[PDB]
Each structure stands twice: as C-alpha cells, then as structure tokens.
Subunit: 236 residues, 2 copies
C-alpha cells in the first residue's frame, strides 16, 4: 500500500504480473515460471525464526503458470531466492514470503547460491547498514553465446514437469542513498555457475545499460541521473 | 452511434496479457522488450472487413521500427538483413484491407518475428493465414491471436533446453515455433475454436495445417498467456473441428 510505494519509489522496472508482498515487490514471468524482477528497500533499522519458513507456491497466480518444489527436487539446482530471506527479518510474515516459489529461480548451489551469490547479498546488506535508504533490483537473465557456426544462441535448461527456466546469469542492481537525495549505484551480472571464492564481486560490475538491455527492463527510471554521485565504485 | 470503438471491438474477448501494449489502427499488439518481437497480436475480422478498399496497396508499405518503444528494446531492418530469416508479420498484411494506414502498420517491426522463408512464412504459415480468412468470410465475427513460442527439447544429457538463435546487433529472438488461435462466431454468441502450433521450420507443402492442432491449454501453457479466457465453455460448439 504505502509500503509498496516506499519500496518502488524510484520506479517499476516493468509492470508484468506484479505482486506486492509484506516487504518486497515482485514481477512474475508466466513463461519462465520465475520472476522478471524483484525490488527491495532496505534501511539500517529494517536490517523471528527462518526455520519456520516453507518453500511453497504463491497461489495468487494462475495454476497453469506455477512452479513447484518437485520441479527443483532432484534437478541439480537450489531454490534460489531473489529477494533474500536475510533482507526481511523484521517479521515472520515478511521472511515467510521470501520462500514463495515466485521469488525463486533455479540456481547452482555450491559455488553460487551458497557462496559467491551469497557474498554479493551480504555485501549489499553491509553497505545498506551504513546508508540512509537502499534499493535493490534482482532478476534472472538469459544471455546469448556465440557457437561453432558463428551464430549467437540463447540456450537455457528448463527443469521439472513445469519446465521452470534455469537462467544463464543473474543481475543485481543496488542503489545506496549516501547523503539525502544522493546515490551510489552498483550493477552486477553473475553467471549461474560455480564461481571461485577468490573472485571479487567487482569483477562482475557491468554498466546498468547492460542489465536493462538484457533483461528488457527500465531500472530506476524515475531517478535523476545527476543524483547518482558514484557508479560501480567510481565518483561522478 | 453505439458501434464500438476499434480497440474495444478487437479485444472483446479479452487481453491475453497486458505487457507493453500498442493499439494500432486495426490490430492490437503486446511487445516483448526481451525478445524484440511481440508477445502476441490480436485481430478482429468480419466478412465486410475482408472486402478490399480499392486503392489500398501493400506495395506502398515500408518495413520500419515502431520508434515509440525505448531505443534499447527496438529491432531494426538491419537485424533481419542477411540474417537468413524473413521479417514475418504476426498480424498479416492480408487481414487489413480497409485503409492504407491500417496495412502500413502491419509492417512495423514490433509486429515482425524472424521466420523461415521458403517452406514457412511464404508457404505453410501463409496457408494457415489463408485458411483463417476463408473461414472468417463465412462467420459473423472472427478473432485471431498470434504469437511466437520458445519451446524446449530433450537433449542427450537427458536434460531439456530451450535454445534459439538471436539475430543482429539487437539480438532479436528467432522463435522455435508460432501459435495461432482463431475464434469463429458461427451464430450469435456461439463459437468454433481452432488452435495451432507450427515449428519455425521448413514444412512440406503437402502437410495439412490441421496436423498442427493443439489443445488451447497447450498454447496457453507454452506462451504464458490467458487466451479467450472470458468465454463460457458452453459458448464453444466446436474445438479443432470436433463436436
Ligand atoms: Mg539464496
Ligand atoms: Mg508472413
């Protein structure tokens, strides 16, 4: 209601099958059976037993477009939450909802979901605690690669009876309000793959344009570019 | 006086989705920023609308981007040029015969998908389009929803993959298949439904279009869309020629 406007202050990346939860906002893709994007707003103050949580479908979407635990089970992938449970520990209801399958994408486990991707999540929280407001957009990507015939193909696995898409990569875009009305921007794209623990997350910095162009989204479109005072660690 | 406004008339039986919608003069389109082609298009035909207004000429139309979408999500003629694929119109030029503007707009790249030419766009796919017009000439109203599909195949590792080429600087998706669903009003409030999925591939000319019938549910699951979702089932008197 008013919370959703707080979360979405800087713009909707898109308007497709939008659902507003207690403490995050999500756009769902009926074709991939995972999200287009999720948006979160963090503050030091906003940053309960996670063990009570249950992976389950959000049944406010049509049945024919749901993913299920059986799709992820024995798939070789984790149920990887886009809006991290660790970002929503203010109430049991908030964290419970991060375990909805609409907020999950199939993720490589060891080496990614459990490690380097988690490192990135921890980074955003660490910085968010020193900031006024923070906004995080997170979502899957399906990126082309050149093949042996010299042509470009998008190729991605689908898992389970419901053919849930396994993204090739994920994006995360963080906006940190360092001083009132002034923001630091950080944009990342990481492969859905085993990543060495030694790889610093800055190696995955990309221009925001890359995220937008690849995802088909318009990110922080309400925000005046002149209010961005730092971008991927570089002063502006 | 009460004759409906055009977009309302076209969309009488519901929007399959609401993403990046463009209402053109004589068809409605939902555009996919990720694939740089449509999610779906919807058209409404009647026998009268299939009577050509003399002087309207497809020869005067130009393929061109609809520049009202953000630049970074546009396709261009150069994406298709030398790609190995035709610019295949989802809402067919031949369905829009009553004004030059109306047919001009079918040549917007938003309404184009990369299609195999010989044996598909120019042949079996066109056979399906012609079939729909032939049937529409005998119905009170006809509604057609058309769109691209990206469908999985089982590979040798025992895993399923969706794989499709992307073409040009803008990485326009080449759909694996296309769907078409036609709703034919045969008597007031009663409808015949026809649903098809064809591969974006060379198809033998001798193959009957009816070989590509699928249940509507199949199209919906594949496309991630809710198609003719407001229809009472009792209003449907025939499905894929049956009943
Ligand atoms: Mg996780
Ligand atoms: Mg054609």
């Amino acid at each position: 209601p008013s919370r959703s406007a707080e979360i979405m202050k800087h713009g909707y990346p898109g308007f497709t099958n939008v659902r507003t939860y207690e403490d995050f906002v999500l756009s769902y893709d009926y074709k991939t059976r995972t999200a287009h994007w999720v948006c979160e707003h963090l503050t030091p103050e906003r940053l309960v037993d996670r063990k009570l949580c249950e992976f389950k479908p959000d049944i406010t979407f049509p049945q024919k477009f749901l993913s299920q635990n059986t799709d992820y089970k024995c798939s070789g992938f984790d149920r990887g939450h886009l809006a991290a449970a660790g970002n929503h520990r203010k109430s049991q209801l908030a964290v419970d909802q991060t375990f909805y399958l609409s907020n999950m994408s199939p993720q490589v486990g060891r080496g990614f979901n459990r490690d380097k991707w988690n490192d990135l999540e921890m980074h955003c929280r660490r910085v968010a605690k020193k900031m006024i407001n923070s906004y995080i957009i997170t979502g899957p990507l399906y990126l082309p690669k050149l093949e042996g015939d010299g042509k470009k193909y998008i190729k991605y696995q689908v898992i389970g009876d419901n053919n849930v898409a396994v993204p090739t990569h994920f994006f995360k875009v963080a906006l940190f309000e360092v001083t009132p009305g002034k923001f630091e921007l950080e944009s990342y794209i990481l492969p859905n793959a085993v990543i060495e623990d030694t790889v610093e997350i800055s190696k995955f910095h990309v221009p925001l344009d890359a995220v937008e162009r690849s995802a088909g989204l318009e990110i922080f479109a309400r925000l005046d570019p002149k209010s961005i005072v730092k971008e991927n660690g570089a002063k502006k």
